[PDB]
């Protein structure tokens, strides 16, 4: 459960790597019995390194975004509860986008957070596409978890990208009418997994220049779920859907 | 002062060289007797790139004229500039090889080429800092393709640091005046890859195409095609002789163009090219003439540059330019046909300007493209040569001399590896 | 620092690891 | 005392110095003959006959550039034993300026410095002038400034390099000859300025209202900045901004010596009357991303330590008052770990007019030198653009055949990326 | 202090300011060269050279209108950095003013305001000038008034909009681009005056005894109103009618900021001697329905709160005496819930004469700004006129193809009908 702040993903060291198999003695049911079939196995399944699809110029925006998700769905999303990278919020962009240059080369099991990063990195060749990050504050029984998506905008219509543990928080096709009902698909996704919502974090639109040094603004607006009106969720977030066009 | 001895091999190279020095003797204001009658002293301060001095105010061009065919010496000896050249430099044999390559390289050329290197070493001794050797010849012929490559492999043995230029007029499939043109062409290129470090594969089809379409002359009577390749021959070395805002030597071009040591085959191009009396007065304007300079019609090699992405491009301007308007236009060209350039060479269009135009214009700009669509120039010849080599026709005129039969199968593989090497980057990234 | 050996033997080690961890995170809630 | 010599390398080095020393002759009344018809001694070691030899050495390996200066105007001003000149251009090549040809003419240049560094009682520092666009400007300067810091350890050395633009480009091998330069200019240099050449076209088109500026319209705007940086050494005011003072008033670490220059005002003669050019307007114009002298947006990054250098009819009352607007109630965020602000470099002498007719006269100026962390996006191009070329091993054989080992590019990129990681390191304080 | 800039937009907006700034130079002695041969600083930020620069931002997306100003007379008065100019005219298309082309040139107009709003110690407010007749006057202003309300929240912003006339018309999409702009000016604006274009012909026909008036005989009368509204900020008297302690004498509710202007006297030169132009007839002329600036009859509706803004040689004795006849002994019925009456804006400065020869000089003048509910009859002739066109869905495909959602007309008509219900809501007190 507590993800680490380690460095040197490929190749791995001899300190962070040895605690991957001690942590599974608590949450995974076997713990040490799987070490004879994972660490104690010379033979292993050879999953290759898939490449990012270099799109031809006769491929428009929504055909590319499925081909973007056709990369990240085959990226083997991680469940081990330990981060493999050096991803931070307060991080410069070229220190982060060049870390995404070490995502196609490394291609380790990744979590939901850097999928938002790689969703930005695999979308810089679409200047008509405007993106923005949205993080959720999900309420379990007394606890607060985070789920961050990447909301997109092409031809006026909305949509969102991202990865999670289940299918209902993944890629949304870019055909939604407004922005408020787009979050409602995530809100209906939280009703199935027995999740309550607390806050919706709106951020500034990420600038379309991959070689630049600025921090990514994730907290341009905060929408408290249980402590604000439902009409304000369809009006202030609708004006914020136009306010992202107001900066531009 | 960087120096370049200039070797007019062959006969067509001698035909374009008699119009090459006619450009330069006008460009420095040198009379046909050899004196100086120029007005501005900025053209006199550096003439030693292309000239010498006699014991007066009388200059003599650093030129070596080589042709097995005689009599065409007597054209330029009795032409408009017969009293300009050094008469000791006129080297010519007796017979004249009749469109043969083995004759002219093995048998006939070896009995003459030692007289040349006693002159090219005589001219290398009066030069302070030698830059390179230009030589202008016709590929596919007898002399300029068989004596020329013998002359290069003897020069590059003695000077492995000096640069080399080769303005080889390649053969064309539509305008061919020789039945053994696809034999002398494919034998020359194997001895042209390994020795020269930048050629200029001009063609004689696109020169005929320019004088009908672009220049719109009635009759291209060979005083134009031998002149139009002379303007883009002075245009490469117009920064060595004139103070520019941003100037480029021949070493600067060959360090900016070839990404690998085998890819030196450049299709040159010159602009502006008006009509004879219409566009030079009425229609054409002369800022941003790169739209003319990048067109498929205004090339020298008869190849379609849209059929293959450029590797590197050098545009040597000449006029009194304005370096924003040079470079802002140069970005707009690179962003327009952005699929027509190699990905892994970003910002490849080399600029270079000067301060003195040709006499009779205001601005002018050559263009030296190192395209990959030059593989279409070699896919025609290696189609025609492989057709005749099946029947093995016209082979006793080469195997009759001291040339083996396996030399052709070796020379075709050395060409087809080059077309395999040039196709290696058209599709990869 | 030799590569293609440590970065593929321990790369497929996690690939054999998360196959049960993917199944574990979807079996704790099926009620 | 307080002498300061300026060396010039490359085609960019002389063409700036042809118009840089054009400006100093107007800033001291010195004729083109060197014969003044007070204190010019920071730039002119005069002779007893009445002449004034400028303390500069022009270096180029190709003779076609200096012979313009050696024969046109200002041909009697310079000293003919100091215009060092090679024969081969070696151009667009780092190794041919650092190993092959530049190795030959170093012993004539470095000897000529010691024939000028032995006339200085107080030597403030060296002022190199080159471009990163290949040839001698990066090949020979990497050999020169490595050779100077051996013989002159405790001496400052400025660097007015012309960093290559992202889009506007001249050399094809332009990214290769800049990754090989920063391994030199990280160690041996000090406060290496890096102006760009595309960013002046975005200044000389809107701020200065002329169309299609030549290289004589950017090498005068680069001349005024080296004037007003060294305007403290030769005039009066409330300055105390000599080159050893503002050096460690600027750099926070030995690796963050890459500020950007910015001049203001640059308004043309037509709109010189339609705007009152007072000190609140002059500083507020000096912080625009459309007014910097490099292709970077400083709003994206954060300033570490600026250094304003005013000159002319200002007073420190409203200079310090107009600063507090820009200091506090703006969104140009400074870094957290230094709240002291920035140097103020008030000088008395107003800037002059070069008579070529480019920008009209004013009463105030500023050459702000911000050590922002927005230079990490200037190297973000060339860390990628060179790596895009080196992946296919293009153009390497023109360096590995000249003396350069093939592993040098794998060393230079490895160093220059760790610098960019180090530049983005000091941008954050709180967790 | 008390500076007040004025932005202009449209074919109407520059053509008014071409003749409005013609008037202010006469009201301060300013030459056409901007060089006065006291206190003008509410309209002129002067320079130290003796010049004067007007504080106005002439914008238009089409170049053919400002180039009349930029080439003829008054070409040296303005500043060339502020005459913002696009390339496409954005031909009568609100979506081409609010989404397509106006989005490109917003960041230059908004940048020029902060280069003028930072020279203002006391900023009274903004004075926009546009027409509701399509194009940039309605499309680009809706992208501008929405823009200024973010950066300048607590700041007044007047609006001298031209309303589309009922019968006289120029555009075909005049009713389309006026329902779309009132969704902007209902919220972001403040005291949006809406003069008409037909009603000034019926002043230039009978009150002014000229025939065939051009747009120069009609923009002089719209320049005199903006003169005597801002005659409190730059002259003396018994005023206290600055634009924030006057606009809270206007609005009873935040949605009723739509007064009408009315100027008096407008008597021609040949009729100037045959009438003693004194304050009894001068005040009674303002309430004639044949003397309003909008084609509407205020005898139909009821006034809420006027604002009589005098100027010239008056005294407050008979001002308060001539008011009481109009207040009580008349049938111009006020609304019941405000019995205090209206403001009084006595100023000392008499109005001047533009030398084009339109109206001779007088000694008194009014600009009464009545917040009557007779503007509801100026919208029922637009609510019906728009819905007659939208019922057949004509011309909608020139907006939905330009980046505008088709449901916005069903929102703008829904909004502006609820405003008309709200404007008629406060018309009755007792049952
Ligand atoms: N560019 C030009 N090429 C020419 C011209 N005249 C002929 N030729 C070209 O040159 C070719 C023939 O010239 P060559 O010098 O090769 C004939 P050869 O080598 O055998 O020497 P000689 O027999 O002494 O003439 C011919 O196929 C054409 O392609 C010309 O005027 N200009
Ligand atoms: N800003 C500016 N840059 C210049 C100027 N002149 C040349 N440059 C730059 O110089 C770069 C090319 O490098 P060079 O200065 O020619 O260095 P070099 O190769 O050693 O010089 P040569 O050997 O004589 O060719 C180009 O990228 C230009 O940007 C100038 O006048 N102003
Ligand atoms: N009162 C008045 N109205 C005018 C005058 N000139 C033009 N107009 C009005 O202004 C409108 C012209 O369009 P603009 O407001 O400038 O906006 P636009 O559609 O973009 O026009 P352009 O900028 O020229 O393309 C017309 O509907 C006229 O009614 C004038 O002099 N006085």
Author numbering:
A (entry chain C): 58 to 305
B (entry chain B): 1 to 429
C (entry chain D): 26 to 56
D (entry chain A), E (entry chain E): 1 to 37, 47 to 440
Which text from the study accompanies this structure?
Microtubules are built from αβ-tubulin heterodimers that stack head-to-tail to form protofilaments, which interact laterally to form hollow tubules. Detyrosination of α-tubulin regulates the functions of microtubules by altering interactions with microtubule-associated proteins (MAPs) and motors.
Using cryo-electron microscopy (cryo-EM), we have determined the structure of GMPCPP-stabilized 14-protofilament human microtubules decorated with catalytically inactive human VASH1-SVBP. VASH1 simultaneously contacts two α-tubulin molecules in adjacent protofilaments. Compared with crystal structures of VASH1-SVBP alone or bound to inhibitors, there are no obvious conformational changes of VASH1-SVBP upon binding to microtubules. Our 7 Å lowpass-filtered EM map shows an unaccounted, continuous density connecting the last modeled C-terminal residue of α-tubulin to the active site of VASH1 through the positively charged groove. Interfaces 1 and 2 are between VASH1 and the globular domain of the α-tubulin molecule that VASH1 would be acting on. Interface 3 is between VASH1 and a second α-tubulin molecule in an adjacent protofilament. Interface 3 can only be established between VASH1 and microtubules, but cannot exist between VASH1 and free αβ-tubulin heterodimers.
